[PDB]
Amino acid sequence: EREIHPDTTPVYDRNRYVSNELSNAKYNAVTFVPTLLYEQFKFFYNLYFLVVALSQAVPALRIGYLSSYIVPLAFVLTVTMAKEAIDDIQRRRRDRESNNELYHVITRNRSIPSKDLKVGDLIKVHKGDRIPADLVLLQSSEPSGESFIKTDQLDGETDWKLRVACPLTQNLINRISITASAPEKSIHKFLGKVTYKDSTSNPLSVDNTLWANTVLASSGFCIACVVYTGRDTRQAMNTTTAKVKTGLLELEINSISKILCACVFALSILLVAFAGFHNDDWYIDILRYLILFSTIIPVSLRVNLDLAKSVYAHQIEHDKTIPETIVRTSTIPEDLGRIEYLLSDKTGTLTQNDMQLKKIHLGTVSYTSETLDIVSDYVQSLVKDMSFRVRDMILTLAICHNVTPTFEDDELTYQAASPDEIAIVKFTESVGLSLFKRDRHSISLLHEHSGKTLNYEILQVFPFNSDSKRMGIIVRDEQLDEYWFMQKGADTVMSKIVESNDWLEEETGNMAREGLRTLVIGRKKLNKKIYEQFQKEITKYLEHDLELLGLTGVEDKLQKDVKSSIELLRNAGIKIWMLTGDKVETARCVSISAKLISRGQYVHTITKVACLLIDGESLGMFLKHYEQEFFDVVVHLPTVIACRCTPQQKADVALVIRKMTGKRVCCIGDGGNDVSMIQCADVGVGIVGKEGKQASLAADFSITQFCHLTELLLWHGRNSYKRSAKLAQFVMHRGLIIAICQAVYSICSLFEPIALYQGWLMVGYATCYTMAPVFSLTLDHDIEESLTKIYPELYKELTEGKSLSYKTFFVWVLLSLFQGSVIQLFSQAFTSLLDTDFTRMVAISFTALVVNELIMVALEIYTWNKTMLVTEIATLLFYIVSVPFLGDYFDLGYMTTVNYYAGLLVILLISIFPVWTAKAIYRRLHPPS
Ligand SMILES: Nc1ncnc2c1ncn2[C@@H]1O[C@H](COP(=O)(O)OP(=O)(O)CP(=O)(O)O)[C@@H](O)[C@H]1O
Numbered sequence: 001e002r003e004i005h006p007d008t009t010p011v012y013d014r015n016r017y018v019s020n021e022l023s024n025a026k027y028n029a030v031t032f033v034p035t036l037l038y039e040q041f042k043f044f045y046n047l048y049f050l051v052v053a054l055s056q057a058v059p060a061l062r063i064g065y066l067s068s069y070i071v072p073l074a075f076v077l078t079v080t081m082a083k084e085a086i087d088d089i090q091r092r093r094r095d096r097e098s099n100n101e102l103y104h105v106i107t108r109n110r111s112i113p114s115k116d117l118k119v120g121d122l123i124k125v126h127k128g129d130r131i132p133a134d135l136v137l138l139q140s141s142e143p144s145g146e147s148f149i150k151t152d153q154l155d156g157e158t159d160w161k162l163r164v165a166c167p168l169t170q171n172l173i174n175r176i177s178i179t180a181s182a183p184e185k186s187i188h189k190f191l192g193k194v195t196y197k198d199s200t201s202n203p204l205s206v207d208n209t210l211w212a213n214t215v216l217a218s219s220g221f222c223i224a225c226v227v228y229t230g231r232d233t234r235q236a237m238n239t240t241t242a243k244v245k246t247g248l249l250e251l252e253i254n255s256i257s258k259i260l261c262a263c264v265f266a267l268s269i270l271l272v273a274f275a276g277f278h279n280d281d282w283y284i285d286i287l288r289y290l291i292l293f294s295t296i297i298p299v300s301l302r303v304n305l306d307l308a309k310s311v312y313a314h315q316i317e318h319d320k321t322i323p324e325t326i327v328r329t330s331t332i333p334e335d336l337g338r339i340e341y342l343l344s345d346k347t348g349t350l351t352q353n354d355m356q357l358k359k360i361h362l363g364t365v366s367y368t369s370e371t372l373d374i375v376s377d378y379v380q381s382l383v384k385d386m387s388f389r390v391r392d393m394i395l396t397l398a399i400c401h402n403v404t405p406t407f408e409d410d411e412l413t414y415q416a417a418s419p420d421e422i423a424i425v426k427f428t429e430s431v432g433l434s435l436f437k438r439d440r441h442s443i444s445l446l447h448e449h450s451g452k453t454l455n456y457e458i459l460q461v462f463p464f465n466s467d468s469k470r471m472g473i474i475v476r477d478e479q480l481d482e483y484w485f486m487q488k489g490a491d492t493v494m495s496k497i498v499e500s501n502d503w504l505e506e507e508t509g510n511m512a513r514e515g516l517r518t519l520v521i522g523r524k525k526l527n528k529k530i531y532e533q534f535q536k537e538i539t540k541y542l543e544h545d546l547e548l549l550g551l552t553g554v555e556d557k558l559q560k561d562v563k564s565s566i567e568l569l570r571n572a573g574i575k576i577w578m579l580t581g582d583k584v585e586t587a588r589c590v591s592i593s594a595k596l597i598s599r600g601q602y603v604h605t606i607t608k609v610a611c612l613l614i615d616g617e618s619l620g621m622f623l624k625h626y627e628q629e630f631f632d633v634v635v636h637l638p639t640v641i642a643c644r645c646t647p648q649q650k651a652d653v654a655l656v657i658r659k660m661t662g663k664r665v666c667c668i669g670d671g672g673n674d675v676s677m678i679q680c681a682d683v684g685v686g687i688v689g690k691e692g693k694q695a696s697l698a699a700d701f702s703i704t705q706f707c708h709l710t711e712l713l714l715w716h717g718r719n720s721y722k723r724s725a726k727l728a729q730f731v732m733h734r735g736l737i738i739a740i741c742q743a744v745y746s747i748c749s750l751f752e753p754i755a756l757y758q759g760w761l762m763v764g765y766a767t768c769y770t771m772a773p774v775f776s777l778t779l780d781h782d783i784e785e786s787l788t789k790i791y792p793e794l795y796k797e798l799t800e801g802k803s804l805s806y807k808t809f810f811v812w813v814l815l816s817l818f819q820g821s822v823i824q825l826f827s828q829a830f831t832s833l834l835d836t837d838f839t840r841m842v843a844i845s846f847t848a849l850v851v852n853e854l855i856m857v858a859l860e861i862y863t864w865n866k867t868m869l870v871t872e873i874a875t876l877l878f879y880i881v882s883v884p885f886l887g888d889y890f891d892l893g894y895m896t897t898v899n900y901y902a903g904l905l906v907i908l909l910i911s912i913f914p915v916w917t918a919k920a921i922y923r924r925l926h927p928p929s
């Protein structure tokens, strides 16, 4: 709470208030680098190769070139800051160029920057410039004081918001004082007071304030007074750092990284023990040999995965089948492939948000889409008692809504913040009572039918609330001058308020199991004196005693091709729930019509202080104490339906599921009514085409309505997981092969394992000779995108993890042992291992190893793309031409013997025959189609 006076300039200009300068990282950015790295320092593989780097800091463990040392760590740092440092420096850039934006001061009569701006002084902000800070409107260019504002960057709202000024201060210019409250966090709330001469209090709210990222129009300029200072602005509190996201793939990579660390440590112990424990310094020997074993795999895997994220995001955002998709968190674009649960809303996500009124019932008299003649002639007769009730009901429909019009040649269009009333006005104009232009800021109501033009005006309005479930108005006529109080909303709150009437409950139930969402209308005749004593000013006095008018039933057309999507889902074996705050009867009806339940599948319901339905209170009570047994029940049930849920229990459901099973779930939603279930989700998908947009921009993914996600999960997540699995398999594959090569060399020559490979050879093998086949396999697939619909069942082949486990690691280890051992032993046997021809043995070893890699990458090929087959030939010719001139220091010699090629071909044939035959027999064993 503060008191703002514009005439007391120095007391805020000097100090006591935060300057408009925003600083992010200066003199602390260095302190920022380890702690952020600390999360990366939490993962044991980063620890692993970071200690590999740190080992050579001792001036005794330099075993290879420094060019083999700097490039991996430098390149991984370059990649990992490539995404974030550019954004950080751009943030600093438009922070600095915004804080020097010149602004005119009424008192100082000259332009000053944002730094010189203070609190309480009056600024004329123009149409073509953004609002600098948080202010409150006191005078505008419009005599009414109303203007349209834009906050596309402040919050997720994209439409243009009404903002009125104080009527007392809009006429002004004498000095005017304000009183404000403490800094808060709410993005849709404000409170204040205006004090003028002789202390005349004037109220303030969110309707009369402008914040830091607001954009002005609907005027030329306006006079506004600053309120919040620097850090006190809500953007400094309502914006928080995004939490780190962890995928299961990287966790199991960390696990197998520890496994490989232990394995190579044991191998180093074995080689050192077999050496004879000489040289009197065992520890330096085991450390240097460990580093020699640990210099190929851990760093290459990281960059391969990062390039995988990059190309995967490119492929997602470069599909004609998937128009206008946005990835917002590229840290884990991978877990979508292994998802078992779907948590979703029906509002927009599972619907088209197209509304049509179908049945309306008043006084045991039911009207439908048909029989519009009676209601039409009633409208024409507006300008016995049942007819009067009908026309009054039409009047209440046509007035109480908060819809905005827009004119064109014909079929005048309507937009609002709740489109159910757009459906209402559509029905009313279809009957014959055509509403027209609405000020929605001043008092005007125009309604023309086949007769004569009718005009009203609202005496007072109360906006709808997400908790009040109500909206009420009072309206005065000009033609007949009566006071009509009208109330609209849910019956659950106003049923006891309206009357002691009997015919509400059972009819609401009737249209409930008709699959119709229904709201209810009441009226009351008021007078002038009670209206003005009400206007003297809590909520209790507004509603005293109403009278029921009727109720309406509106249906919605479900989303395009829901049934195909759902059948593809449970032929993919994936599990889907349904949590939404709707009513139980409309929920079961819409799930039946969406074919969420097949034949049979008995439905059970829960109400407390196959299929199953549970209310929100009972959901919280079962998530309250009886947690674990409830979790055990819900996991095995094919479908779960919940009703009457405010988002906190949705977030709790997500948290307890992810914490009690450790699996990856998908939680898709839209609008402000489900903001929590994305921010706590493993993946969040945005919905476009519906009024709500903050959740979609605050999400991680974006699809049109529902369809893309389907093809995003079947054809894209599965392929992503398969190619990542092949990448990991191949990288540990050739790393273990070369490591076993050095190991067998040390067995056959007890000098040192270092003596086999040093220098540029291992550098090029780590970087230049092998990455191109890996990135070629990164693009390879098997099944066309058009064919993923026919065969979703392959999902049931990835839920278990048969490709990433301990046994998979052992299988790849054993295969690598086999091939590396046969190559090394046969080479040493056929080449007569000595110290003179050592160049010949090491050359044929490197050549055979690299060509074996470049052939086995071709073995694991499903489709032969025109862009893929060139990649390995380029590396092959690069190897061929890199021998005589590029390297030309190590392993120099002839090597072009007639018997050399024969021996090489036979040894490679021996090494690649059993795996090729095994793949052929496995293809004969498990034929896909
Ligand atoms: N402006 C409004 N004020 C009060 N209640 C409303 C409303 N618009 C719709 N309702 C009804 O109240 C219930 C909850 O509305 P809420 O304020 O949570 O928005 P919502 O996004 O959940 C609409 P829905 O549930 O139909 O998708 C809905 O079942 C709806 O029928």
Ligand SMILES: [Mg+2]
Pocket (backbone or CB within 6 Å): 669, 670, 671, 672, 673, 674, 675, 692, 695
């Ligand atoms: Mg929402």
